[PDB]
Amino acid sequence: TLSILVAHDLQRVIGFENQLPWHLPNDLKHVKKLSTGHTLVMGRKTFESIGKPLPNRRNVVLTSDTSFNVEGVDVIHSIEDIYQLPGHVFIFGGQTLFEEMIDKVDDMYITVIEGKFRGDTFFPPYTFEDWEVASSVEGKLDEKNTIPHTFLHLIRKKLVPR
Numbered sequence: 001t002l003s004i005l006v007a008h009d010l011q012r013v014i015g016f017e018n019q020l021p022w023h024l025p026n027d028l029k030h031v032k033k034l035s036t037g038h039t040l041v042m043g044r045k046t047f048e049s050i051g052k053p054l055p056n057r058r059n060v061v062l063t064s065d066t067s068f069n070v071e072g073v074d075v076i077h078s079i080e081d082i083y084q085l086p087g088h089v090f091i092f093g094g095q096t097l098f099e100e101m102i103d104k105v106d107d108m109y110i111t112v113i114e115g116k117f118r119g120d121t122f123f124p125p126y127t128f129e130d131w132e133v134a135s136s137v138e139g140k141l142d143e144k145n146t147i148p149h150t151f152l153h154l155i156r157k158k159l160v161p162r
Ligand SMILES: NC(=O)c1ccc[n+]([C@@H]2O[C@H](COP(=O)([O-])OP(=O)(O)OC[C@H]3O[C@@H](n4cnc5c(N)ncnc54)[C@H](OP(=O)(O)O)[C@@H]3O)[C@@H](O)[C@H]2O)c1
Pocket: 005, 006, 007, 008, 013, 014, 015, 016, 017, 018, 019, 020, 042, 043, 044, 045, 046, 047, 049, 062, 063, 064, 065, 077, 078, 079, 092, 093, 094, 095, 096, 097, 098, 100, 121
């Protein structure tokens, strides 16, 4: 399976100055539970923002840098390399990789951050006419998680005659 994994706000903001605009620990635990034991594919800028690979999963970084080499990170240099990765592959970001892959993935795990943040990077527009809501689960709010959010699992709809 090839999946998108993303958090975006009410206006599809995903980042500001190479950081998540929001502080929401519950969504990082969501990311952890979905992607442990599988593969994350991310662009170079997204990797440098995190700074080190996330433990207990394959970390794949897409870059044009022939010199790129980080311990615990596998490097690919073209989009076509993604389809050769085994197992469940999650497209992890950022805007550039999302734009290149949104028309190719089987499904999307989207955390909708129910707010309006200042951003400089965005998830591409998409329509629920094209995507079936396999599940929609409201995140629970508490002391450390104060922004309403919704976990969506969207599966691409099949085009059928009538
Ligand atoms: N909210 C979320 O769920 C989420 C998730 C991830 C990231 N983000 C945010 O997204 C922002 C970064 O997005 P971004 O688009 O600016 O950067 P990005 O997609 O993370 O990285 C872009 C880089 O990836 C490499 N790349 C992309 N496509 C390629 C291709 N076809 N072939 C070879 N290399 C390729 C290039 O690296 P080189 O220039 O080294 O060749 C390119 O400069 C950050 O603010 C981050 O916080 C948000």
